[PDB]
Amino acid sequence: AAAAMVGRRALIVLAHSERTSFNYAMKEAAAAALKKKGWEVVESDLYAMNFNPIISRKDITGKLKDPANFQYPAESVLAYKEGHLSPDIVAEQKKLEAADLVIFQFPLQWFGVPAILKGWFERVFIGEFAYTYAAMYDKGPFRSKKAVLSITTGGSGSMYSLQGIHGDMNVILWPIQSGILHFCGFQVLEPQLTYSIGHTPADARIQILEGWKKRLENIWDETPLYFAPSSLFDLNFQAGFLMKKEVQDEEKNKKFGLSVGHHLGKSIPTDNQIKARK
Amino acid sequence: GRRALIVLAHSERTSFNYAMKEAAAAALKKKGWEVVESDLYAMNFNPIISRKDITGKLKDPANFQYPAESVLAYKEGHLSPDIVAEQKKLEAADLVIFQFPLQWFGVPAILKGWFERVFIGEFAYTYAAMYDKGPFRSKKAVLSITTGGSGSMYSLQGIHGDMNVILWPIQSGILHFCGFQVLEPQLTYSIGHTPADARIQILEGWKKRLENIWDETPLYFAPSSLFDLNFQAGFLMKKEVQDEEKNKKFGLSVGHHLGKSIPTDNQIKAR
Ligand SMILES: Cc1cc2nc3c(=O)[nH]c(=O)nc-3n(C[C@H](O)[C@H](O)[C@H](O)COP(=O)(O)OP(=O)(O)OC[C@H]3O[C@@H](n4cnc5c(N)ncnc54)[C@H](O)[C@@H]3O)c2cc1C
Ligand SMILES: Cc1cc2nc3c(=O)[nH]c(=O)nc-3n(C[C@H](O)[C@H](O)[C@H](O)COP(=O)(O)OP(=O)(O)OC[C@H]3O[C@@H](n4cnc5c(N)ncnc54)[C@H](O)[C@@H]3O)c2cc1C
Ligand SMILES: NC(=O)c1ccc[n+]([C@@H]2O[C@H](COP(=O)([O-])OP(=O)(O)OC[C@H]3O[C@@H](n4cnc5c(N)ncnc54)[C@H](O)[C@@H]3O)[C@@H](O)[C@H]2O)c1
Ligand SMILES: NC(=O)c1ccc[n+]([C@@H]2O[C@H](COP(=O)([O-])OP(=O)(O)OC[C@H]3O[C@@H](n4cnc5c(N)ncnc54)[C@H](O)[C@@H]3O)[C@@H](O)[C@H]2O)c1
């Protein structure tokens, strides 16, 4: 009936302290659904792990190159290559290497990810492992993997609409989806947005769980979000990593920009960071 | 005698970030400001929200909810004392300066956590008082950021895309949301490839700016009065205001682009 997805691995990263939370419920739902379709599922429950989110010298267990002028980016890359990274970092890196699908489950906090997840990015997404300056965006190491955000908010969807007090949600997601995930190569799927979960009745919450589960059955066949391909740009320091001139000329006449970040002073394509286009 | 709080998020005293903090403190003191600091790494500050932040009796320990529990604790005064000490510095401060390196297109984890544990409901925001009506409307804030990448990379045509979009969640979502008037950010691009003689010039320029910082015009955000501030209306833009804007070519701000063009450098330069 569905002899598929049998070879495939999934990592679920959760950033909530309480097992009584709807965030925890969504993580359980995701794991169940994926297992049922024959995925292997690994988890990182950052609060349960008591994960340490602060970068420091202690992340390098070997010999620093220049302890007088300590620079986390350079020192962390050397340590990755020589294998004297702190073992909590390495364990997470091995889960990522193995995973084909990565799901991030968290509550929106101050228009962003929780501190503990931010720190996970900071300590685990090391140079050479997750990105290089030669291989950015679509050429990056994780180009064979897919990622998706599943977010809960306290505020209602109207508040994050084009005319809402808080403003467009597409703008809020951009730094995360483009700046962190796509930067390392991930194909980014449509975010799962659960608005105003605190004022949602029980019957509706169950529908949401059921809908999440249903989505996950075919998650791998979805079309990803649109980001400008790197090939539109001159990727060297002399050109300034600017958009190629021929591409500027092709776009001179169009009404819409390419993406939220590449709006080009024009209109932002509707729901660029929320819905795929095919 | 006005008061200033400088929040720093860098671990190394050898860093240009540390240099900029020292420069800021010197300049402000010279002009007769009182200067308080939060060096988050030096303080070994704890950035993770937990039950431990409430020292008293939880309202509902079976179904723990940080937003509700933190607000009760603020009102009854059983917040963890590390949180309270920071809150007292904020209350006193007229000017707040945030000094940090851009990390993953955002603030460092340790500063994010500072926001999460210190900007508690009732203290920093309510629901009645959002944005320009918020508790900190009498105070001014400014970001001072360093990046490794060059400014061309964050231009309209750069690989990384518009810097105005990157700053919006911080300046609007965190700072303006609580009432702060937000001043033009101090952006130091490609600090890694800047020599010592140039860095000292930059420090000197930072210092020069700070002598008149209080007289500057703040960034533009859509006033709250353009909106229907109740749950039934959905906090949407009022109909009359939608009609007045229907024909204009530019939107109001980065977040309130309204499907039109974003006013140039909305989050970087004042009017
Ligand atoms: C520091 C901070 C910053 C914040 N910033 C923002 C912000 O910028 N924007 C914003 O919109 N919000 C913000 N919030 C609010 C926050 O995003 C919400 O509290 C969060 O999304 C709630 O998710 P939860 O899983 O914790 O819900 P809970 O309140 O724990 O759960 C919601 C409801 O679902 C019920 N439930 C749990 N499990 C199940 C189940 N299996 N089946 C059915 N019902 C179930 C619960 O019992 C409860 O009734 C912020 C909160 C904090 C603490
Ligand atoms: C996890 C992580 C994520 C990152 N993500 C991004 C990203 O998304 N985008 C981005 O653009 N960058 C990113 N970076 C890079 C980061 O922003 C830069 O490395 C940072 O801005 C460097 O600033 P610094 O103060 O540490 O100075 P450094 O350049 O690291 O070192 C300071 C130098 O200044 C010198 N100096 C100090 N004081 C003085 C003085 N008074 N006079 C003269 N010289 C002085 C010191 O001697 C030293 O040589 C990231 C880095 C990390 C670790
Ligand atoms: N933008 C931000 O930075 C930010 C940060 C935090 C929260 N928020 C806001 O959080 C809201 C989500 O709803 P909420 O978390 O405020 O819900 P809430 O806590 O106000 O839920 C209210 C319900 O809980 C009941 N209740 C009983 N005792 C209570 C108590 N001690 N405290 C609170 N409620 C009690 C009320 O009677 C009512 O039924 C959104 O409006 C969102 O904007 C925004
Ligand atoms: N996260 C990011 O966005 C990002 C991206 C790329 C690189 N980085 C980091 O920062 C570094 C990027 O380099 P950078 O931007 O600091 O400097 P750079 O290496 O690009 O400096 C350019 C060099 O050419 C010269 N030069 C600079 N501008 C010029 C111009 N307009 N015309 C002619 N010559 C010019 C300079 O004197 C310098 O020697 C990388 O080494 C990496 O560590 C971060």
Short mmCIF file of C-alpha atoms in Angstrom, two decimals, chain A residues 16-18 20-21 47 50-57 67-71 109-116 118-119 121-122 125-126 130-131 136-137 156 158-159 161-168 171-172 174-176 178-181 183-184 199 228-230 233 235 237 239-243 248 255-256 260-268, chain B residues 10-12 14-15 41 45-51 61-65 103-110 112-113 115-117 119-120 124-125 127 130-131 150 152-153 155-162 165-166 168-170 172-175 177-178 193 222-224 227 229 231 233-237 242 250 254-262:
data_model
loop_
_atom_site.label_atom_id
_atom_site.label_comp_id
_atom_site.label_asym_id
_atom_site.label_seq_id
_atom_site.Cartn_x
_atom_site.Cartn_y
_atom_site.Cartn_z
CA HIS A 16 9.83 23.72 25.00
CA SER A 17 10.38 22.92 28.69
CA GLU A 18 6.91 21.52 29.48
CA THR A 20 2.07 19.45 29.05
CA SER A 21 2.52 21.91 26.15
CA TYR A 47 15.34 21.34 27.54
CA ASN A 50 19.72 20.44 29.43
CA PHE A 51 21.53 21.66 26.32
CA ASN A 52 24.10 24.43 26.78
CA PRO A 53 23.32 27.30 24.33
CA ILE A 54 26.32 29.55 24.96
CA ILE A 55 29.42 29.55 22.76
CA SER A 56 32.71 29.58 24.70
CA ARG A 57 36.33 28.38 24.57
CA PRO A 67 44.37 31.99 22.85
CA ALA A 68 45.53 35.62 23.06
CA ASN A 69 43.12 36.73 20.33
CA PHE A 70 40.32 34.14 20.50
CA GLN A 71 37.96 33.95 17.52
CA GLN A 109 9.30 34.14 21.30
CA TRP A 110 9.97 37.86 20.70
CA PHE A 111 9.41 37.43 16.96
CA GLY A 112 12.07 34.72 16.78
CA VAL A 113 13.30 31.34 17.93
CA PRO A 114 13.84 30.64 21.68
CA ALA A 115 17.28 31.39 23.09
CA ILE A 116 18.04 27.70 23.59
CA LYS A 118 19.37 30.00 18.78
CA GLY A 119 22.32 28.68 20.77
CA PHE A 121 22.42 26.90 15.79
CA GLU A 122 25.39 28.86 17.15
CA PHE A 125 26.25 24.92 12.62
CA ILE A 126 30.03 25.26 12.43
CA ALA A 130 27.20 23.35 7.72
CA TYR A 131 28.47 26.11 5.39
CA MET A 136 26.44 29.23 0.12
CA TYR A 137 22.68 28.94 -0.27
CA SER A 156 -3.92 35.74 16.16
CA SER A 158 -4.90 38.75 11.77
CA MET A 159 -2.15 40.44 13.82
CA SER A 161 -1.44 39.78 8.21
CA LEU A 162 -0.40 42.54 5.79
CA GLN A 163 -2.66 44.95 7.71
CA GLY A 164 -2.08 43.61 11.24
CA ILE A 165 -0.53 45.61 14.11
CA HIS A 166 2.57 43.33 14.10
CA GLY A 167 3.02 43.26 10.32
CA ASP A 168 3.73 40.62 7.70
CA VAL A 171 9.23 39.30 7.02
CA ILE A 172 9.55 37.67 10.46
CA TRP A 174 12.94 35.50 6.45
CA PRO A 175 16.07 35.76 8.70
CA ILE A 176 15.49 32.20 9.92
CA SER A 178 16.91 32.28 4.39
CA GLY A 179 19.64 33.38 6.78
CA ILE A 180 20.10 30.13 8.76
CA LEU A 181 18.46 27.23 6.95
CA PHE A 183 22.26 29.52 3.83
CA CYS A 184 23.48 26.00 4.72
CA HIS A 199 -7.55 30.61 22.67
CA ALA A 228 16.86 33.49 -5.55
CA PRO A 229 19.41 30.93 -6.90
CA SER A 230 23.05 31.76 -6.17
CA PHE A 233 24.98 36.54 -8.46
CA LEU A 235 30.11 35.24 -6.04
CA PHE A 237 34.72 39.91 -3.47
CA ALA A 239 32.09 42.17 -7.74
CA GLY A 240 30.71 42.64 -4.20
CA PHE A 241 28.44 39.56 -4.31
CA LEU A 242 26.02 41.66 -6.34
CA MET A 243 23.35 40.48 -8.72
CA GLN A 248 19.34 43.25 -13.29
CA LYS A 255 6.52 44.42 -11.00
CA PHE A 256 7.48 41.98 -8.23
CA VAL A 260 11.32 39.03 0.78
CA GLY A 261 15.04 39.78 1.11
CA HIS A 262 15.46 40.40 -2.63
CA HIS A 263 12.46 42.72 -2.98
CA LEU A 264 14.65 45.04 -5.11
CA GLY A 265 12.61 48.07 -4.00
CA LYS A 266 9.50 46.62 -5.65
CA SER A 267 6.54 44.57 -4.38
CA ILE A 268 7.16 41.42 -2.37
CA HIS B 10 30.78 39.38 23.44
CA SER B 11 32.91 36.91 25.40
CA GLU B 12 36.36 38.40 24.56
CA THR B 14 40.19 41.71 23.07
CA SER B 15 37.23 42.18 20.70
CA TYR B 41 29.26 36.94 29.39
CA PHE B 45 24.07 35.53 32.81
CA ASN B 46 21.62 32.66 32.48
CA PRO B 47 19.65 32.97 29.19
CA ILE B 48 17.16 30.13 29.61
CA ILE B 49 13.60 30.65 30.84
CA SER B 50 12.51 28.02 33.40
CA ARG B 51 10.42 27.44 36.54
CA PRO B 61 2.53 23.63 38.58
CA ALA B 62 0.66 20.87 36.73
CA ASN B 63 0.15 23.02 33.61
CA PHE B 64 3.07 25.46 33.72
CA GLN B 65 2.86 28.54 31.49
CA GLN B 103 25.18 36.02 14.61
CA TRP B 104 23.09 33.93 12.20
CA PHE B 105 21.28 37.05 10.99
CA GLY B 106 20.21 37.88 14.54
CA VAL B 107 21.23 38.64 18.11
CA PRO B 108 23.47 36.18 20.05
CA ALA B 109 21.68 33.52 22.09
CA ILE B 110 22.74 35.11 25.38
CA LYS B 112 18.01 36.76 23.12
CA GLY B 113 17.66 35.08 26.53
CA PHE B 115 15.09 39.71 26.39
CA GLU B 116 13.18 36.52 27.21
CA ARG B 117 13.76 36.68 31.00
CA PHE B 119 11.04 41.81 29.27
CA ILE B 120 8.19 40.34 31.33
CA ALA B 124 7.82 45.92 29.52
CA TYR B 125 4.46 45.55 27.70
CA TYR B 127 -1.72 44.51 25.49
CA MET B 130 1.74 48.21 22.69
CA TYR B 131 4.17 49.95 20.33
CA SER B 150 30.65 43.63 3.54
CA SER B 152 27.43 45.26 -0.53
CA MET B 153 26.30 41.79 0.58
CA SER B 155 22.44 45.90 -0.14
CA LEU B 156 19.23 45.59 -2.18
CA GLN B 157 21.18 43.57 -4.78
CA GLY B 158 23.51 41.67 -2.41
CA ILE B 159 23.56 37.87 -2.03
CA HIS B 160 22.20 38.11 1.56
CA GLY B 161 19.51 40.69 0.80
CA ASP B 162 18.28 43.90 2.40
CA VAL B 165 14.54 43.23 6.59
CA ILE B 166 17.03 41.60 8.98
CA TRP B 168 12.96 44.65 11.52
CA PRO B 169 12.13 41.75 13.95
CA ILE B 170 14.54 43.23 16.50
CA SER B 172 10.03 46.63 15.68
CA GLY B 173 9.24 43.30 17.30
CA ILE B 174 11.28 43.67 20.52
CA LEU B 175 12.26 47.29 21.05
CA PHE B 177 6.86 46.81 20.83
CA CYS B 178 7.77 47.84 24.40
CA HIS B 193 39.20 42.94 7.37
CA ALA B 222 3.38 53.01 11.73
CA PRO B 223 1.59 54.69 14.71
CA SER B 224 -0.68 52.40 16.72
CA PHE B 227 -5.16 50.37 14.02
CA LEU B 229 -6.77 47.94 19.11
CA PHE B 231 -9.65 41.54 19.80
CA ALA B 233 -11.47 43.86 15.11
CA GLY B 234 -8.35 41.64 14.99
CA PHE B 235 -5.86 44.49 15.51
CA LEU B 236 -6.32 45.36 11.84
CA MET B 237 -5.61 48.64 10.11
CA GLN B 242 -6.73 51.60 4.27
CA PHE B 250 5.09 53.20 -0.98
CA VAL B 254 9.26 47.13 6.27
CA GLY B 255 6.62 45.16 8.18
CA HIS B 256 3.77 47.33 6.89
CA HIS B 257 4.79 47.23 3.22
CA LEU B 258 1.13 46.52 2.32
CA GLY B 259 2.21 44.70 -0.85
CA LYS B 260 3.80 47.87 -2.25
CA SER B 261 7.37 49.23 -2.23
CA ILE B 262 9.32 49.46 1.03
#
